Design a protein around this ligand. Structure first.
Ligand code: CA
Ligand code: CA
Length: 109
């Protein structure tokens, strides 16, 4: 909408419209679709502040809920299985959060 061309609002919206059905949680496709897998450290660090929608130096599940609204104004809030598989894409230590190093890993795959 009113964001930088670093991200394609349409691609964000696209995968988010798809990852709204339980069982259709291809969020890794989200990263590669929106172009997030082609981000530089600096970009990924502002994206850090996105999963940290609270800006608390830590990114918890409750943040991943509205973190998408912080990513894009017309984004969908992730559901049970959606947030789960999405988080675990990077969350390897299983602490219900996105460690930003876990994050870089999940985006890169
Ligand atoms: Ca936070
Ligand atoms: Ca973790």
């Amino acid at each position: 909408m009113a964001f930088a061309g670093i991200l394609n609002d349409a691609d964000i919206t696209a995968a988010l419209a798809a990852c709204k059905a339980e069982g259709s949680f291809d969020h890794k496709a989200f990263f590669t679709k929106v172009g997030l897998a082609a981000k530089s450290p600096a970009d990924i660090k502002k994206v850090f502040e996105i999963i940290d929608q609270d800006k608390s130096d830590f990114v918890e599940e409750d943040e991943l809920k509205l973190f998408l609204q912080n990513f894009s104004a017309g984004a969908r809030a992730l559901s049970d299985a959606e947030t789960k598989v999405f988080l675990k894409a990077g969350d390897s230590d299983g602490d219900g959060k996105i460690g930003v190093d876990e994050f870089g890993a999940m985006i890169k795959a």
